[PDB]
Amino acid sequence: QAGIIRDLLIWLEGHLDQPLSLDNVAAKAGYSKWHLQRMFKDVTGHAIGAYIRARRLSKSAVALRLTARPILDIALQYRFDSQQTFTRAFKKQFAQTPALYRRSPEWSAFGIRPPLRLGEFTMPEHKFVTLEDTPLIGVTQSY
DNA sequence: TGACAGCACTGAATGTCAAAACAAAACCTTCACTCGCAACTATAATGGGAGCTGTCACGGATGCA
């Protein structure tokens, strides 16, 4: 029912990292590999399988732009199979070399796909301002 | 009744043949200069000890004489 898929993503957003998962591992959620896939297609508007590894790449794209690791820390970190295939699907998502992607300081959100909620989404508000050069005092350290 | 389990097949999306380029310094030319050899200079000059070291002490030694 509608209470299932919402609870599956509470697993899945927390288990987008730890299990090396395809839909066979996702088939342990009450029904078969196809029926859990059939139950997702209409209650969401997204198609689960190519989305998740792309969402796990979208989890890896912010890891490719704001985390301090090289290509092979994050080659198979997000449960992938190869690096050149990971480089390949990246071209169909961001149209940029990952060496070129962390070359430019500008980070545009083209291929990052948002995390899905079947329940109610807490929408933040926006207001566009233009700020001023203000002196302060503080120290720096890294992570 | 509607879930509920599994099949039919697209195909985008992999797993392989190739280069494509970029810094990596790595080994390597370079090319001007800094950093070193070597020789000469023509009034006249001509013999150390460089300070040192001062009585221990019985004992065996070899060679001189």
Strand B footprint, Cβ within 7 Å: A 1, 30-32, 34-35, 38, 50, 53, 81-82, 84-85, 88-89, 92
Cα-trace Rg, chain A: 19
For tokens 């969402």, name the residue. A55
Q: How far out from the chain centre does Cα A36 lie? A: 21
Note whether A117 and A6 are within 8 A (CB): yes
How far are the Cα atoms of A2, A7, A21, A56 from residue A33, in angstroms, in the given order? 17, 17, 12, 20
Query: Where on strand B do bases come within 7 A of a protein Cβ?
Result: 3-8, 12-16
Altogether, the residues listed in chain A come to a count of 143
**In the structure, how far is the CA atom of residue A14 from the C1' atom of nucleotide B46, in angstroms?**
108
Helices A33-44 and A48-66, axial angle in degrees (round to 10): 70
Helices (H) and strands (E) in chain A, counts: 5, 0
Return d(Cα A27, Cα A92) in angstroms, integer.
28
Note whether A56 and A16 are within 8 A (CB): yes
One-letter amino acid of A19: P
Residue nearest to nucleotide B13 (CA to C1'): A89
Return d(Cα A2, Cα A4) in angstroms, integer.
5
Return d(Cα A64, Cα A71) in angstroms, integer.
8
- For this PDB entry, the determination method is cryo-EM
Q: What is the DSSP letter of A45?
A: S
**In sequence order, what DSSP letters do the residues of A7-36 get, joined into one string?**
HHHHHHHHSSSSS---TTGGG-SSS-HHHH
**In the structure, how far is the CA atom of residue A50 from the C1' atom of nucleotide B11, in angstroms?**
12
Note whether A42 and A1 are within 8 A (CB): no
